Amino acid sequence: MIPLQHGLILAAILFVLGLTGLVIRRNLLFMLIGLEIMINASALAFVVAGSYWGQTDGQVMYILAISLAAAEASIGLALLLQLHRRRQNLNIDSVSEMRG
């Protein structure tokens, strides 16, 4: 009753919204938030694909995706805490010393 195309398009909308939030924001925290949005959109697309075929494989890939999301959110927030400790600001443009 639900089209597969509509679920895929919803996942794509959330993915490009997360990418936009990743690019436009100077604060590192909103960059991590956009990364979480993109990975949740990818997991949602896998759930839609698995539910269309009547397979468990979509939910299994969802489990793997949220395991990755948990690990990446942990590591990124640790790095953000380190940045706020060392430099007392979360401006990502100031972390730009290496160039050339």
Partner 1 sequence: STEVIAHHWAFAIFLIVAIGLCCLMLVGGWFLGGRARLSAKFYLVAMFFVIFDVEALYLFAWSTSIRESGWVGFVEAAIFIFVLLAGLVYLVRIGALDWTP
Partner 2 sequence: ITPQNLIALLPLLIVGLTVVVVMLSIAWRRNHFLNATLSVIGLNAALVSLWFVGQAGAMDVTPLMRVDGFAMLYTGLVLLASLATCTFAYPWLEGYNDNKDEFYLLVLIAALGGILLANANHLASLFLGIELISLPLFGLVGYAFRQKRSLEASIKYTILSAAASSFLLFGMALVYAQSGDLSFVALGKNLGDGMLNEPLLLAGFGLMIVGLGFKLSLVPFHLWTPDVYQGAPAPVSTFLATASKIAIFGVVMRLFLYAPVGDSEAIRVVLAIIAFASIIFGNLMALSQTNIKRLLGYSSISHLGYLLVALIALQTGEMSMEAVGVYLAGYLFSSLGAFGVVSLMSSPYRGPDADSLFSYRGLFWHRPILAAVMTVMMLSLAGIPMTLGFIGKFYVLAVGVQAHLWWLVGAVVVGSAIGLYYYLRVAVSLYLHAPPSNWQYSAGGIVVLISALLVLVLGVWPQPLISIVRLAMPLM
Partner 3 sequence: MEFAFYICGLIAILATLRVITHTNPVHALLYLIISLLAISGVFFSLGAYFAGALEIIVYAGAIMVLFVFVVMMLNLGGSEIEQERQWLKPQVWIGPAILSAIMLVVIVYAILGVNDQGIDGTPISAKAVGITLFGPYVLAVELASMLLLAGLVVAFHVGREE
- In 3D space, the residue among 43, 22, 35, 28 whose CA is nearest the CA of residue 73 turns out to be 35
Residue 19 or 33 with smaller CB distance to partner 1: 33
**Closer to partner 3 by Cβ: residue 1 or 98:** 1
Q: According to the binding rule CB under 8 A, does residue 77 interact with partner 1?
A: yes
Contact 39, 68 (CB under 8 A): yes
Total residues at the site for partner 1 (CB under 8 A)? Answer: 10
Is residue 90 a contact point for partner 3 (CB under 8 A)?
yes
CB-CB contact of 17 with 30 (8 Å): no
Give the CA count within 13 Å in the CB-facing half-sphere of 94: 10
**Residues lying near partner 1 in the complex (CB under 8 A):** 63, 66-67, 70-71, 73-74, 77-78, 81
